[PDB]
Amino acid sequence: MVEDPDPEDFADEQSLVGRFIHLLRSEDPDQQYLILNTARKHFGAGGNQRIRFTLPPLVFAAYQLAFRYKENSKVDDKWEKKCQKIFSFAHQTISALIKAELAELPLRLFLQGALAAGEIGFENHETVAYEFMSQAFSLYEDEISDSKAQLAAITLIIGTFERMKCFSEENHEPLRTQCALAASKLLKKPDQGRAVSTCAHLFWSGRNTDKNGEELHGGKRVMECLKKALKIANQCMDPSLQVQLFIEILNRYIYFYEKENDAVTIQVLNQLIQKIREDLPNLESSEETEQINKHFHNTLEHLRL
């Protein structure tokens, strides 16, 4: 693309920063931090085109250094304070990418920061994690418009949040319902159905700190998500795409059934399989239609075994 930059133009910058990080990983943590700050300043003077490539490695180096501090947790009594400084460094560095008018990358780097913070568990790590998630959601709302990019990002947000175990119920519930809302407000109906059903997982395998580290197991709220996704699937008009979504939602109902969600009944499974049996034969024969029949076939096979 003539209008777009050629990546082969920043290959040397990339090679440099990789060679830099590899050699830095030899040095003592306390020095590593210093040299990262020095690196931030040196690479920061490249300008908006180059910082895209030279800065994300420094972000990842920082997360890594934080886990180093944690393994030295018995030797070094300041490790928590150094972690705090490190995520601060990460936040600033990512924020510079925003200033350079990027969104997709900084969003993902904030999610990575949230995960890391969640896992390390230094003093104040829940606040740091909440902040990082909040920043990702800001970039989601403000800067990502293309319907494809939205679906991608929201799945990544949900996926990231689903593995996190560091939030109290008072921080976990806002994030849950912010995910659910964004998912329901995607432009296209199919994308909406998918993202909403994807949200079901947050109410189930999501972990807050209130239950001693146990999953939420909110089977009721799971059903509500899938109920919403089904409503969205009826409003689809394209017959192939509608039957596709029915099958997808069914497999998701099965998933939670076999994970022993008591709110998923065999009635519900039966109503949805029956609906599919009816609608499925009314499709135009094609490669795509065989694939849909095969998917339903496979689902039914699994139900028996």
Partner: protein, 182 residues
């Protein structure tokens, strides 16, 4: 027919290169197909795959620059219909039930996925699942000890021999797993 299965290089986000001993083992001429789970992050790494074979299949990782790599792919090699996805779209990440649900949709004999950075191979409901791990042993927030790892599939006949290479300490260790389609 031998297929190279690798991914999650993360060059240069998290690493600068493959391990020297892996570079050595990876030689042109012998590999027929490459199936890559994504997250190389740079075309430089793509060109490198092209030198090892002339049938490269790649899917889009969550940190890949190139928006022209497909989200998922079905490649049929010999008698095997192989699914290929990065795995950030499978939720919860790495979950087997979640992985199987996708098999039902793709209708594939083997399903390859990545993202976890943890090598894994296993059979479930008469289907085979492979995760080659990260060929560079890249950082990952959810696993502190990451072992550089990649996979070679050998097969011609309704049978699969997957050799898993892992860099343990400073030396390469191989493990052989056999799967046959029912």
């Amino acid at each position: 027919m031998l297929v190279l299965v690798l991914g999650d290089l993360h060059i240069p986000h998290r690493c600068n290169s493959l391990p020297a001993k892996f570079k050595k083992l990876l030689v042109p001429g012998k590999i027929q197909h490459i199936l890559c789970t994504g997250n190389l992050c740079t075309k430089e790494s793509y060109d490198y795959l092209k030198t090892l074979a002339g049938d490269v299949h790649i899917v889009r990782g969550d940190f890949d620059e190139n928006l022209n790599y497909p989200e998922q792919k079905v490649v049929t090699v010999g008698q095997f219909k192989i699914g290929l996805i990065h795995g950030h779209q499978v939720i919860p990440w790495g979950d087997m039930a979640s992985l199987a649900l996708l098999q039902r949709q793709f209708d594939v004999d083997i399903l390859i996925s990545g993202h976890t950075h943890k090598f894994e191979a296993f059979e479930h409901e008469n289907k085979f699942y492979i995760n080659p791990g990260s060929a560079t042993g890249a950082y990952n927030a959810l696993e502190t000890n990451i072992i550089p790892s990649f996979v070679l599939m050998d097969i011609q006949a309704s049978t699969v021999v997957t050799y898993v290479y892992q860099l343990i300490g400073d030396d390469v260790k191989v493990e052989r797993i056999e799967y046959k389609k029912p």
